[PDB]
Point group: D5
Chain length 56, copies 10
């Protein structure tokens, strides 16, 4: 499992309010958080599928 | 019909304005509510189809 | 966890070749399968999010 | 509810494999069916929410 | 065309600003409006094809 | 309305099967047809909204 | 091309902020503008494809 | 406009039948074609806005 | 690669909050940025694939 | 850069023609391949954005 999947989700400094998915290491599944629209870190997925499959 | 299908919709603490679907037991079908983007409860569906079939 | 999440995925008799998601009880996560487009059973989700959240 | 809501789903002659939604009076909910692309009848919805709200 | 197709469009008390279609009986065509995310009335269509097929 | 709104729908030579909208001068509204993927003619719209707005 | 392809883009009175396309008669192509959600005018397309096809 | 915008559209050896846009240098506008799913050449756009902004 | 690929992202003046993609020469890949809705500059892509293929 | 980012794309045994993204290490960016719809390996991304960030 990529180390980056253990990083807290990261909204960044931008205005948008968009759903993205991140791996919650502790709950052990992908959840939703709000993403500003810029300067994404790696635990950030457009698609929940991609999320589970990358950090499952 | 899972228990969670009877809990009221939960916006959550986040500040997004994301349309979602919850099963309305009183009414007997899925309806739209506004989801804040994080900390979702289980009566929350990105897809209306998924909502009617899971809670139908 | 809804009992229906333990049912094998079910393509049905229709022509379409569409991705949908089902809960693989054994692997313990949601995966892709092909859905014919009609006569869905309950372990079938338009959205991977909805899938995890309903059968996680 | 409207009366076209009582018609059976019509795939029509054309060759596309597009998921659409029809009200199924019997089961009392909107379901998926394959629409062929041309010559649709009235019990036929692009959006499941439209179907639940119109024929629900 | 069903009676509700004559109801004026209804935004609702919710906080989203999402595009929906309504049948405008005067002009005799479907048009856009802003729906606020919840408590939609029946003359409210996510898809335009559904609006004109159901009300036009 | 533009004179192109009257010409029949042109599926074209290509092999794809994509739902597109066209103005049905006779029936007075926009209906679906199957576009092939190339050599489109002008009575051909990706969006049903656009079709009614332009040819309605 | 239709005479409506020349009129300026009409954002309108409504509160939404939706990206739409319009024909820029001057620059000779379709550009983006922000539509408000209601009282659209005809130089307004949901699909960029439609815009170039109609006004190009 | 970059040179590749002049390359004719390329379907590829793959088996899908997906709509894409290419700049057609003769006509001087972007148009549709069928891409087969793999080994796209650069004059191949998922979005039309991107095609005309990049090649038009 | 084209030279507009070297420009910095431009949000422009308008108020929408739409994720778009720009090539970031420094990091050597396309990234997200917020586009405002009007007056886009050329290093601006609706689709990430378009961005990677055009400026990759 | 996870190991899986270097495995070749895998269509799988299913018969869908679903566009997806894999990271091409040889080329140094994500490209499209055709995914059969089941039994996906990890170098499979519904979203190009997710692909470039996970394997970039």
């Amino acid at each position: 499992r990529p180390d980056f999947c253990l990083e807290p989700p990261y909204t960044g400094p931008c205005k948008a309010r968009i759903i993205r998915y991140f791996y919650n290491a502790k709950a052990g599944l992908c959840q939703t958080f709000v993403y500003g629209g810029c300067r994404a870190k790696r635990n950030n997925f457009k698609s929940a599928e991609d999320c589970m499959r990358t950090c499952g």
